[PDB]
Design a protein around this ligand. Structure first.
Ligand SMILES: CCCCCCCCCCCCCCCCCCCC(=O)O[C@H](COC(=O)CCCCCCCCCCCCCC)COP(=O)(O)OCCN
Ligand SMILES: *[C@@H]1O[C@H](CO)[C@@H](O)[C@H](O)[C@H]1NC(C)=O
Lengths: 458, 165
């Protein structure tokens, strides 16, 4: 008495025989239905993994998402089949992975060129997952197709080649290196196995030259234990910003904090001056060492890569504020943008908020000895920022700080590198990557100059 | 001397099969097989094979039976198969030069197919080739699992048992 989801739909019956299932109107026994569904699940799985192999330019984002939708649909159909039994079921349906493949060997390889290879590769991948984790083959398969859908969605993440496009390049490299080491099946954890405010304020200037966002200052089985701690911190930061911190503001703050958290875990962060941050970083060295005995940054790069979807989903908790803006699996590429770039992008956004806050005081030439001065204070920080960008950009030119120089020249090579289009000038960088709320002082390049004393209008 | 292995598979449904079988070493019963595809018990009557080897052997035999059933289901799905269907498989190895092996399958008592290791190929025994016969031979001659891994069973694993016991 259960129904199993321009396609087929079925109504199944099941006894303790006439334990038939009905689709003109095809009527089969339940056992035939089950077999039909299972062999199609296995055949379709192999075809999907094969088709997506080249991505596992936007053409495969569309195909990759379709795969994830497919995976979820099949998982629901599976649940509906289990509703016919409601008893946590004989081996006739509970095939072991070795049993399932031995039983469906001919039916599935029949559909493929070099099918014995595809049937084998799938068996080995499923055995590897259960070995890491005599369970039913269908459940192990579902976990396998879910991991692939997640891995693929990460690769696409929904005249000028942007920082986001280059970040995707580094993302694709990241998993590539991970895939070659092959450790993700070991490093991906399972949570169930575990346990300033003012806008007009200039950024803190730290040498022992980087400006530290107030947002970063206000930051909240060793693998399973670590993932549980990271997920908790991620959830807390998301709730912290949501409840204690604009739409664009709330989204960028959560997303940048996510990227900052990845930097902390990877150990590639800039703010190493703070003793609380140092205490945290030492705890990470300790846990990852424990993990290794399988600065630990290269393994950490993999572990965070093996566990970035889990961390991101944790940051979407308890909210109706969509943050799903330009990414697949709603997962951003910000953790693949060198921190110095994201903080720069961010500085400009905070600066233009500061300019508007001061601008707005000039309403109902004495008051312009505060604005155009508060402006000067923020103007100086840009100077420092602009100079450092130019040094690294020029190194990239000659090449075409290591992660930034390598990011820039690869971005430059894809942007005319041989004149550079829009990224050779840091003012130009901000005008391509950041969003400015400033009023009447919209130009960083030196009438409507971003740091002018008095706006051309006032 | 030799092994003469026999199984009879009674398919009341493509998805419902009763298996029964045995094996004789030389002239005497050594093994039996009986039960449905979901609960088939394979018993060594003369416990001459080490328990570990035997467990591995049973696993291989169960794998065989599941693959066998899968082949029948596929044949029935692609080519219509009438039920009840009785499959009778007779296979063996005989030993003073290189061993002789054979494998022949009859359907409802009528020899349907056989294996010829010389080219690692299956061919029909029946003089009447039809869609079922052609399709069954394909799977047999398309996969290394049915062409060469079978030879290791018949020309190596089977004979080692015969030579040893
Ligand atoms: C040392 C112990 C020696 C044995 C002692 C006797 C044991 C008791 C036997 C009881 C009687 C049962 C008789 C039925 C045959 C059982 C033997 C199966 C042999 C076999 O085919 O190969 C196994 C399965 O592998 C494969 O993958 C090949 C199977 C593929 C299917 C072939 C086609 C089936 C016939 C066509 C039917 C068509 C009907 C259409 C209507 C190999 O197992 P292994 O892993 O150990 O490998 C070892 C090296 N390869
Ligand atoms: C399998 O068959 C034995 C008898 O050979 C019987 O005692 C046992 O209960 C059966 N098990 C199942 C699951 O049918």
């Amino acid at each position: 008495n259960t129904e199993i989801n321009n396609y087929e739909q079925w109504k199944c019956y099941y006894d303790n025989n006439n334990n038939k299932c009905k689709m003109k109107n095809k009527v089969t026994s339940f056992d035939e239905f089950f077999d039909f569904w299972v062999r199609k699940l296995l055949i379709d799985t192999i075809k999907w993994e094969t088709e997506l192999t080249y991505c596992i330019c936007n053409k495969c984002n569309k195909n990759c998402v379709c795969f994830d939708k497919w995976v979820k649909q099949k998982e629901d159909e599976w649940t509906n089949i289990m509703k016919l039994f409601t008893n946590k079921i004989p081996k006739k349906y509970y095939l072991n992975i070795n049993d399932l493949f031995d039983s469906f060997f001919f039916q599935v390889i029949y559909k493929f060129n070099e099918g014995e290879a595809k049937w084998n590769e799938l068996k080995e991948n499923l055995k590897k997952q259960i070995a890491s984790s005599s369970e039913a083959a269908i459940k192990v398969l579902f976990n396998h197709i879910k991991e692939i859908a997640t891995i693929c969605k990460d690769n696409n993440t929904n005249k000028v080649i942007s920082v986001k496009q280059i970040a995707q390049y580094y993302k694709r490299i990241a998993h590539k290196q991970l895939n070659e080491r092959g450790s993700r099946s070991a490093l991906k954890g399972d949570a169930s196995k575990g346990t300033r405010t003012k806008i007009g304020t200039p950024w803190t200037k730290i040498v022992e030259e980087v400006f530290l966002p107030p947002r970063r200052q206000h930051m909240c089985l060793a693998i399973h234990s670590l993932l549980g701690d990271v997920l908790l911190a991620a959830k807390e930061q998301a709730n912290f910003i949501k409840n204690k911190y604009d739409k664009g503001t709330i989204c960028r703050a959560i997303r940048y904090s996510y990227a900052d958290l990845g930097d902390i875990i990877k150990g590639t962060d800039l703010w190493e001056a703070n003793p609380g941050e140092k205490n945290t970083q030492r705890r990470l060295k300790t846990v990852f060492g424990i993990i290794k005995k399988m600065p630990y940054k290269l393994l950490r790069e993999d572990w965070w890569e093996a566990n970035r979807d889990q961390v991101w989903q944790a940051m979407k908790c308890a909210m109706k504020n969509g943050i799903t803006c330009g990414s697949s699996d709603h997962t951003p590429l910000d953790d693949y943008i060198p921190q110095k770039l994201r903080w720069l992008t961010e500085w400009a956004e905070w600066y233009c908020k500061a300019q508007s806050k001061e601008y707005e005081k000039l309403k109902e030439k004495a008051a312009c000895k505060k604005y155009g001065k508060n402006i000067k204070t923020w103007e100086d920080q840009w100077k420092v920022i602009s100079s450092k960008y130019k040094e690294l950009y020029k190194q990239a030119e000659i090449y075409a700080d290591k992660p930034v120089v390598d990011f820039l020249y690869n971005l430059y090579l894809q942007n005319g590198g041989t004149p550079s289009t829009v990224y050779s000038t840091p003012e130009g960088y901000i005008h391509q990557e950041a969003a400015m709320d400033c009023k009447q002082q919209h130009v960083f390049c030196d009438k409507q100059y971003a740091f002018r004393h008095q706006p051309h209008d006032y | 001397q030799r092994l003469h292995m026999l199984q009879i598979s009674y398919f009341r449904d493509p998805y419902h099969v009763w298996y029964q079988g045995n094996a004789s070493l030389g002239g005497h019963l050594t093994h039996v097989l009986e039960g449905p595809d979901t609960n088939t018990t394979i018993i060594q009557l003369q416990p001459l094979q080490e328990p570990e080897s035997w467990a591995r052997t049973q696993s291989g035999l169960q794998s065989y039976l599941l693959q066998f059933h899968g082949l029948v289901r596929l044949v029935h799905q692609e080519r219509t198969l009438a039920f009840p269907l009785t499959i009778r498989c007779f296979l063996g190895c005989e030993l003073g030069s290189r061993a002789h092996v054979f494998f022949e399958v009859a359907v409802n008592g009528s020899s349907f197919v056989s294996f010829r290791p010389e080219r690692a190929l299956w061919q029909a025994d029946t003089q009447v080739t039809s869609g079922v016969v052609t399709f069954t031979l394909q799977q047999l001659n398309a996969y290394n699992r049915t062409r060469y891994e079978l030879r290791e069973f018949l020309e190596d694993t089977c004979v080692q048992y015969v030579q040893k016991h």
